[PDB]
Amino acid sequence: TKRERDQLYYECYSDVSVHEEMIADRVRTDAYRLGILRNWAALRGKTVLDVGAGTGILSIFCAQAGARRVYAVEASAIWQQAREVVRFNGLEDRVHVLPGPVETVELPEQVDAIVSEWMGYGLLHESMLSSVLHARTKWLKEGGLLLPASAELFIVPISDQMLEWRLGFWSQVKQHYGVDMSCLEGFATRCLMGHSEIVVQGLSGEDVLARPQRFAQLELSRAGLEQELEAGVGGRFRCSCYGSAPMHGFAIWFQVTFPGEKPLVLSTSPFHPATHWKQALLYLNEPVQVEQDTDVSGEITLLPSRDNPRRLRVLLRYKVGDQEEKTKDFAMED
Amino acid sequence: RTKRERDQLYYECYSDVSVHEEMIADRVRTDAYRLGILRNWAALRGKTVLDVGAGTGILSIFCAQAGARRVYAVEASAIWQQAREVVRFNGLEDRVHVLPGPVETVELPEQVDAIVSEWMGYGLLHESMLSSVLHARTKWLKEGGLLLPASAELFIVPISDQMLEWRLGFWSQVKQHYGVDMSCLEGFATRCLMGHSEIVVQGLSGEDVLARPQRFAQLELSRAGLEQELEAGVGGRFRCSCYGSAPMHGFAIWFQVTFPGEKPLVLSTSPFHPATHWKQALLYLNEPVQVEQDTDVSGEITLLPSRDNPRRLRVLLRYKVGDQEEKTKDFAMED
């Protein structure tokens, strides 16, 4: 039920831990600070809607860039901590915390700018972008500023170092304890790779087996986008492996772009500094060995789950070299 | 919340590889049992063994290697199928017999000369598996029979969790990195991280320990009314004296278990010993208390099963810190 699903979802954000995690994410939090301060021209003297203000930090960054008024809308009980932070920084007169969903809140005026940190695992887990787009339609003036303004999604075949050690563990028992358990490699593979869950795990550049491929671009200003999101977003990809590796499946990640000076990009690439998002891993049922110039192709759609519209679903089709086309349907882990 | 529903959810954890990888990767735990079993070759060579919860079968195989003639590997989760294959692959399928199902209901062809079991949960008694080992002792161990391990001890000490101290202080550091003062959120963070009634499993070290650890219970597995003690709740009074000035966050408990020898082998989960998968079980007060050198800390702790889930550890804590009034807190193992 909606009532139950919202209450359960907002329960997460009424607790300190996820906000500690988000603000401790320097890459994420510095990116928004600099994205905002670099848009001082467009914000100074202007009104801002912060969609999902949480502890209020981004609304305060907007005030510090010289916005005349900032509506900090927060649906979870954390709105009380945002009010306390705004009062505590002496900005009660410039930042107004409004409890409740952005979909139903009443702003006194339309706004010149929206700022929101709406991105989930795999970019679209939690489906918060719908709330930002709802706010854009209803509260942003024609021509108004969107922070960030766009998002891009990337895919690449990976060999996951940590998964490889966990799979290989059972073959090393004999050397450690004088019992041969190498026969549980099959079992370990079914348990760790044969599930249909998206796995959130940080990779390094060494886990990446080809040139990453962009499979989608979301321009938040593009009319049509709400409908695209419920249809599902994605496309085809093609790439060539660098070398011999046990391929475990694919990583997807995203970046978002603030307008500038010059445009600031917040990346969640494994080639770039770690963020709380890590990457979203799509494991094959078992490893497939690949080689220099092995062709990996397929097609991916990100769409909301039927039973929970905040639950990211990934439909993957893929071909590794001369192995036949396969299909796998993933849902975000609990 | 039916018994058959609680059981199938519990055993579904053990039917998956992850827990068995974690346990076998725990060198301290796994070496202690290898060594504790092989050290006991005398009483095992040519003898019958019951392995209560054989899992992937590893301890059942240590016993065959120790020279046991017949080992019954009882395992209630679907992992018994993986144990059968491990035994087969190590060429031991005539000495080690994997029997599926709960030890409470399975049929051995005979009484056994030894029980071995790795029954220990977080805070020692989380999962309430000791009850199954004792059921099997009563029902299947011969008079004068051997138990591996033989005893367990519970320990308690006031702690100043350096990790929690960092997390509570985090909101005071926001102004320095980002130019926003969020120091006013310390109270909120304290309510969230300390104000709940969950036992937190977390690895401490000496720097976290505020006093001499106190033993608050000794479980001799051979002792008669132990099952009844477990139902009533095991525990006892404790008192200690703080080492220095510190924000006290609460208590850590841990356990060791002892195998008979050589000398007796002690598997310890103390924060002063090498790290295990069990770590320590943390009991936080609702908020920090400032203690000083020689600040007196005392109370009484009971460990017992929860009412709704009998496999869920509950801790009743009564404590007093200096001249603050006695307080009470009732903890249940985190899910």
Ligand SMILES: C[C@H](N)C(=O)Nc1ccc2n[nH]c(-c3cccc(S(=O)(=O)N(C)C)c3)c2c1
């Ligand atoms: C949208 C925003 N920009 C964001 O980054 N949110 C974050 C940030 C940090 C998180 N740490 N863990 C989680 C998390 C953990 C478990 C479950 C879920 S959930 O089902 O999507 N949920 C919100 C209840 C989320 C985080 C979510």
Ligand SMILES: C[C@H](N)C(=O)Nc1ccc2n[nH]c(-c3cccc(S(=O)(=O)N(C)C)c3)c2c1
């Ligand atoms: C008793 C045995 N000796 C042992 O050490 N068991 C272990 C060992 C490692 C574990 N890693 N995580 C868990 C764990 C994680 C979630 C839930 C639970 S549970 O409620 O107690 N349950 C079994 C369903 C347990 C472990 C249990």
Ligand SMILES: Nc1ncnc2c1ncn2[C@@H]1O[C@H](CSCC[C@H](N)C(=O)O)[C@@H](O)[C@H]1O
């Ligand atoms: N439809 C909606 N209306 C209002 N707030 C929402 C919302 N959907 C999600 N939120 C809130 O949006 C927040 C996203 S997390 C980001 C919090 C804060 N802006 C920061 O950057 O640290 C959560 O607090 C969540 O409760």
Ligand SMILES: Nc1ncnc2c1ncn2[C@@H]1O[C@H](CSCC[C@H](N)C(=O)O)[C@@H](O)[C@H]1O
């Ligand atoms: N009453 C019971 N009867 C049989 N098996 C049980 C049981 N209670 C718990 N178990 C099983 O006991 C095991 C304990 S943990 C794994 C122990 C394994 N012998 C090892 O040391 O690596 C789990 O596999 C669990 O499923």
